[PDB]
Symmetry: D3
Subunit: 306 residues, 6 copies
Amino acid sequence: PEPQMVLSPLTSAAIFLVVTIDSGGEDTVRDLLSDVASLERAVGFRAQPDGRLSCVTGIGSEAWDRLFSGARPAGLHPFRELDGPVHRAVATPGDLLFHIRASRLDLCFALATEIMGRLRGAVTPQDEVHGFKYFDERDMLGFVDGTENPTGAAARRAVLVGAEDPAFAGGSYAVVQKYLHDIDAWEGLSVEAQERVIGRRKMTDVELSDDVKPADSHVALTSVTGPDGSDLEILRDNMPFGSVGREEFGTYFIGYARTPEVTETMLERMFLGTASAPHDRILDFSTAVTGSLFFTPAADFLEDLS
Amino acid sequence: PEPQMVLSPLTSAAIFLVVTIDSGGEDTVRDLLSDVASLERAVGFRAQPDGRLSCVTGIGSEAWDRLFSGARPAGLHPFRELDGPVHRAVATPGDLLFHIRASRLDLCFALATEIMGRLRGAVTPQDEVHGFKYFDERDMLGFVDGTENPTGAAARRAVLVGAEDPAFAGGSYAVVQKYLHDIDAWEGLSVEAQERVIGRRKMTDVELSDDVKPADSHVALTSVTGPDGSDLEILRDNMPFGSVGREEFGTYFIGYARTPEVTETMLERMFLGTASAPHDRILDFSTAVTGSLFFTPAADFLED
Amino acid sequence: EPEPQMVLSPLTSAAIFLVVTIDSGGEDTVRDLLSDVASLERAVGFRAQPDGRLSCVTGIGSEAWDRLFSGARPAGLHPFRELDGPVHRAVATPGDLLFHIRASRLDLCFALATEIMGRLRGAVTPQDEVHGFKYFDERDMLGFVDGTENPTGAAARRAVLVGAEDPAFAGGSYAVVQKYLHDIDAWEGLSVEAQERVIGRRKMTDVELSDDVKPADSHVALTSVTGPDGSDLEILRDNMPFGSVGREEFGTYFIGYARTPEVTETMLERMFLGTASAPHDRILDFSTAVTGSLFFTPAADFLEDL
Amino acid sequence: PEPQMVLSPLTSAAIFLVVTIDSGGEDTVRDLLSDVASLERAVGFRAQPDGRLSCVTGIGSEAWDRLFSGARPAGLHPFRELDGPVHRAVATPGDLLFHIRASRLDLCFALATEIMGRLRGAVTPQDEVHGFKYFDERDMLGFVDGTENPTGAAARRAVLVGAEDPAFAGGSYAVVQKYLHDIDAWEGLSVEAQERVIGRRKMTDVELSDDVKPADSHVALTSVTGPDGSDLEILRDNMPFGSVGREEFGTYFIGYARTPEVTETMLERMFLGTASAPHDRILDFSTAVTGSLFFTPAADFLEDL
Amino acid sequence: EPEPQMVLSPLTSAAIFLVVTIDSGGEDTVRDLLSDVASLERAVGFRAQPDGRLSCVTGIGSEAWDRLFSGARPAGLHPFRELDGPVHRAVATPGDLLFHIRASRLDLCFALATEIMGRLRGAVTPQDEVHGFKYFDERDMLGFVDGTENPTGAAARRAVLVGAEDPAFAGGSYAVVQKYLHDIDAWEGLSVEAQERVIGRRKMTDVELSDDVKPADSHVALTSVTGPDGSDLEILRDNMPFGSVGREEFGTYFIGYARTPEVTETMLERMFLGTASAPHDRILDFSTAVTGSLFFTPAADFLEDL
Amino acid sequence: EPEPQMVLSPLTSAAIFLVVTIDSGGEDTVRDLLSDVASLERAVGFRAQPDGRLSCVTGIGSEAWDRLFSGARPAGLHPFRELDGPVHRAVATPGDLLFHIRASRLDLCFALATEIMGRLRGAVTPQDEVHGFKYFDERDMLGFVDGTENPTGAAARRAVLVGAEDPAFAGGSYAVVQKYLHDIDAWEGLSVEAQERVIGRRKMTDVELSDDVKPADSHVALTSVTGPDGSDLEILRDNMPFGSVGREEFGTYFIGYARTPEVTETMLERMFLGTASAPHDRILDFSTAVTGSLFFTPAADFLEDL
Ligand code: HEM
Ligand code: HEM
Ligand code: HEM
Ligand code: HEM
Ligand code: HEM
């Protein structure tokens, strides 16, 4: 099975586009999905080797049933609202996800324009975020973001559907959440207190010792061992965004995994808490305003459609 | 006189910030003015030499009178609305301009964050535009944009206030206009019809010969000669922007000159027309939704 | 595992194409050089790594093969088949060895070509030498992006490498070369839209024309071929511009690789002889073929073991 | 099994650290080995993609028995001294090797600093070398260095333990030796004479033909064929080092192989010679002052401590 | 107030040299092209800035100047003087117009030479067209570093630009071109040390030989010249390798700018005719000149003011 | 207009600092070396351009100057003056010559230092050799951004280069060197906020502390000097980390250039001896000076003609 470009080289810009499919618009979308690889080539081929343009296309649970009449990926379902004592993870509408990445924003934008040109009249926009990484892989909170993502054989193992669902091998599951930060409150904490929130040193990105690492740190709560005691892993490509005039400072979260169960367990521990921790401390400075789940099929699945 | 970095190396990203100054906000504004070059260094230095971060700071006519006593720059006035027979150039409020450029959007955003943090509670934002150039210096209409800009000595002569206004030497004048395009209409033309609207070939960027160039093409209307037969020139750094979901496809125009009279003459020919040309044909596919005029002082003016 | 030559190279901005004939008695000298050409590639290119991307693909013609080797031949190896169309003609021209030398810069290409030719002096006569250069946005001298629909990854390997259908030669490939010259004055008299009707794709944005407007005699229409089982028959091209401004010579050096020459040959038949819906490829109304040769590129270990 | 970054992309800088483990030092060392991959990601993640920072950790024969219980790598023994008729390959103490590579020296230095801060009080330094390659892949003797290193599947076959030692599949063996050069004597040869020493042309890095190449040239002696005629290969990442004030000009040698017997056979041919060569002529300009052998486990083995 | 042409360019890895003669009646088409050549430079190169580094230096020969312009001539403009020495000669070959086109990539050079010759069709006849490439470590075809002792900065401007001695043509320069072909076979028969004695520098490290052991007939010794006041006389060279492996053509294109041709001419006289202590420059026993022409390269506003 | 040495350099990531004393009888050998150092700079550097960015700046001490030359002396040239403060002391150590060698790669620095030391063998005694490396984001050993407030452009020229006030030495500068050893254990024990109060800038963002909170004993406050008129007195710094992890040596090599040494000396006095508001520079509680010397770096042409 040939996968879509989930395991991409590092990129400094992205566009995330989420849409809903209007009544009667299904045949226009099917035609579009069968052409999306060919559009990615047309826009990116002339800009190699430095443009590094890729699009990952994802389909939600309700959209799947409208578009395809056969079998359904095993793990695919609507994003599941989490209502904890203090923090909530909302569910917002999303039928299609276009996760466009490149080494610059104009390549991302050219691709988006062609895609949405083909879809006009058949879809309704729900969200559009222009992302940009900091020059040292930092997010809006000032911390390095990405360090413990898996790489190589490890990332493929964690991210790509295999034997457990063989008609959908080479697919993945993506969860997306747009988070807005309370930057005034964050910058009133001392460096050392911010380090207890995250679980790693700020300037040098060293993990705090097991003896100092609080139970309600982000790193403690997103660390999960499986039945066999091996680490459970996902691949993130979080992107800063915002608008200085409106005081909007953001992290767009996106996590890929071979089954949503892994990403859903991490979210459960963040929002609902554990025996030792009420919730992830990062949520006292971060509000979720979207939540959607998408299956990203293998590339040949998309090509062989009508 | 040390100028601001009006004369910048080429940049692929930019943020344009326009704000109005709240009543009582005058002292906080003046304090940031005196620090803005120090902030520029602080953000930019550790990302050198590839970041190419600069900030150009401009001040409007009405704001100048509220900030400073003594002399006014001789050409500082509010943007003059143009009401043409078909097309119109609107004037819109603005007291300060921040023109921030770099090789990456994140550097721009960092600097804009620090400036705005210092101004909180003293200003009201009017416009914020994040621009990106396409990888071949093309604009939203598909044409190369920037080709005829002056360079070196010619650029300094065209852009920097000199001996005619000695107190303000090394300053310049900036005119901004945000345009929105009718991309549907534009893409309905043949390439050869588009060429005749701009005045140059699409793929090769060669100027159309004078026997073929229409009187109402953009290059024809914006070509202006002065008394001595010299070309009157400006320096532009137009930037694409937009949003695919709202069908917003724009060009942010910014033009620097040594006196606003040059830019204003070009604008009159475009919007009002001449004897041979009803108006700039680029306007049949471009609507202006802002318009403002600023003076960008010499750097040591700000330091003091 | 028979190691293939570098048929599947990363993107390169420079090439030398060298075609020679082997003189009476030159066989021995040629055999010794063939066994050394992988060492020479390492010697010249190592000290420019990692940016250099220096590779050499060596090719052997049908007549030469019989002169250098005894026993079994590749199943598909014959001389290039002249095509005599009602209007257009594909010529066959002499060539026993092909050196296809690529790199991120022309000096690496030239220095390898000097080592090779040094060793063969007295054994071989030059028939063609072409120094190619890519435009900065992957365009050809006709103004179009060139290479977009080439296969990549596993798809590329399947299309270009000999497998179980001829196991003794597994890991080889077949290369066809033609040098074309372009009548640029006649081309530049067409409107952009008329040019796009000849190729099959939009000029600036390299988007494929819709199946409703694509003419049957366009380039892209005639070089799209499906097999009996409905699979796409694909080749890998690395077309390079070349020329001389003084002599008004503006050219494309065509090179295509495939696992069997039947695929390339079917597409040349379509272009020069036409189908029921199309007299010939309209790209030939502005392009003249002046050379044409067919070569087998053996697996690397075949060459080493000499 | 996931190997360490033996098979690195080319790097222009490196730091070679060799230490011994003091009395009582075992626990501190085991704790650090469990964290080293995490430290390498910590230092290097924010400098990607240009940093190319990696760290290969090696453990010596005596140390292995102090640190771990149970099975031992089959090839793992202390470095074997060779006392030739003219030249000697010495053996010197070393328990742990850190091979730090990157595009720039500061990244190498930052990692070293975090590794050694954790080890302070547990270990004694034996050798610290800051290496820098010349901009055209040349060594201190002025020759391109690295040309015939295997690449790809060829390198994985030559370097990585597999089925012959299944408990330790994915590791490798490393020999290091520090050489000091006599540059004044080297530069007194003509280019042509130097070419005869090495076995390759100096400017063009083309190998001399088998008819010209002398029997005692470096390339001739370090070309070995197995039982089947097949070439025996090692991966090398030799690095220049020195100090202009003390007149120190060096090559730090480092060779990786699936079994030490390949590298040990090459050292025998160089220091003791053959029927047609007395010794490797490179050794008349090059003196070994350290020698140590180490096994570099698969990355998963370290993680699991 | 003088704006020079880009004689003092940054280092560039590609060049095209085009020398043409002006046909009878073509004077007016040439004048109109000279007035547009800066515009053409911008058209081609602007969209590849800042990495492209495209420039064109236009020069005009002595006989052509009197056909094209009326009034004053630059003081040192005369035809190249043939040098007939006892062994080696410097030929004088025809040439009305030079276009020295430089860039970081050959395609930018080609595009610009295409536009120029497109407007000159029917008015000029081509005499020479060379496509130069850099070796990665600034070497020439002889394997020595080429450019080391060129002036830079303030020294360069003083060495190259016409000033108050000829004030109507201030900002101009004088260019001398010679195409050389090398006898590579003979050169490579020398020992490295003997090659060093021909040039006067070490090969590998490019350190100048000390004044006691540097031969008097070494390249460096005969091109080192001191004035009446004892100060060095300098020129600015941008020599470029070129060649064709098939035809055994290994070359250096010599191009040297100076504020007055007397400086370049004294160098050539020393090389070809010799001194009391040197018969001729040893480099000439391995290098044959096949073209020789002299041009005046006006200030930039001189061309556009037409 | 004299030509300065390369005091105003583009940013470099590596450096070698070499400080030697001249042995009795060694004078002539040193003078010969001085007349060639620029030539050696070009020999080593030209083939690596333009990324190599190799430069060397040569300085001469007070006592060495009168041993080497007859006639005039630069007005501000004198031995480094010892500062014996109540707590901290700035030592004077011997040094006759300084080579400040910079490039993008340490190997280029080492190659140039090899040639220079090769020429001086037997006539000089080395006193200090340091190999420096800057961190990827322009930080120093203390983990702060180091260089921010250096003057650029014309202001740099005016600050650093001797002009009309000492006309025979115009285009010269003065260099003060101090090798510092840090107590990194003590440093890393401070919170980030307390380290910010030592330096007087934010650690992550490098924004200067506002004047109401900036301590009077911060490094930035003590090294901020206005002159008679109320103009800011500036120097040009190029400080370089160095060390050895095995011997626990973590250092900053200070070098500072200025047109007259009184500016550097005033800053040093405030650091070590304090003011009415501040006992000493707090950076010295974590920093110990183990070398100290002053040099004149004459104009390049002075060196040439000698
Ligand atoms: C406000 C939103 C978020 C921010 C700013 C954020 C930031 C970060 C940071 C700075 C780290 C440390 C360095 C590293 O990437 O390894 C990290 C680690 C991590 N984050 Fe997030 N995060 C966010 C949301 C989430 C969410 C919603 C999930 C899961 C559904 C998640 C999963 C993880 C995981 C798994 C790790 C790696 C921990 C480890 O194994 O060491 N994050 N996050
Ligand atoms: C409305 C959106 C605009 C777009 C998309 C646009 C685009 C262009 C393009 C594509 C060129 C040709 C290449 C070049 O020399 O840059 C050009 C030239 C020019 N534009 Fe615009 N332009 C716009 C607005 C303006 C306005 C408002 C003014 C003046 C006030 C201006 C003044 C000029 C000038 C002076 C030139 C140079 C003409 C010459 O002498 O060759 N443009 N512009
Ligand atoms: C004394 C310092 C050493 C220096 C300066 C040095 C230098 C070189 C040079 C220039 C080459 C030629 C190019 C190449 O890398 O292929 C080379 C090749 C080689 N060296 Fe060394 N070498 C040293 C020590 C060693 C040692 C100790 C060994 C082995 C124990 C060794 C094994 C090899 C191997 C196998 C090759 C490749 C030979 C081939 O197949 O052609 N070297 N060395
Ligand atoms: C076959 C043609 C040529 C080749 C391959 C060649 C090559 C070289 C080389 C390798 C150098 C030493 C490094 C450096 O560039 O400084 C050199 C220097 C020089 N060449 Fe040539 N050259 C040629 C023709 C010429 C001609 C025709 C002239 C003058 C008309 C010339 C003038 C110089 C000058 C002035 C130097 C600088 C000498 C000094 O002051 O150190 N060269 N050339
Ligand atoms: C241990 C030695 C040193 C270290 C680690 C160090 C580090 C720093 C840092 C981080 C800065 C702030 C950013 C900057 O503008 O570059 C700074 C500024 C400065 N340092 Fe140092 N420095 C050291 C010694 C010195 C010494 C010895 C002097 C003078 C004799 C000096 C003079 C300055 C000056 C003038 C500034 C700029 C102050 C301003 O105007 O903003 N420093 N240094």
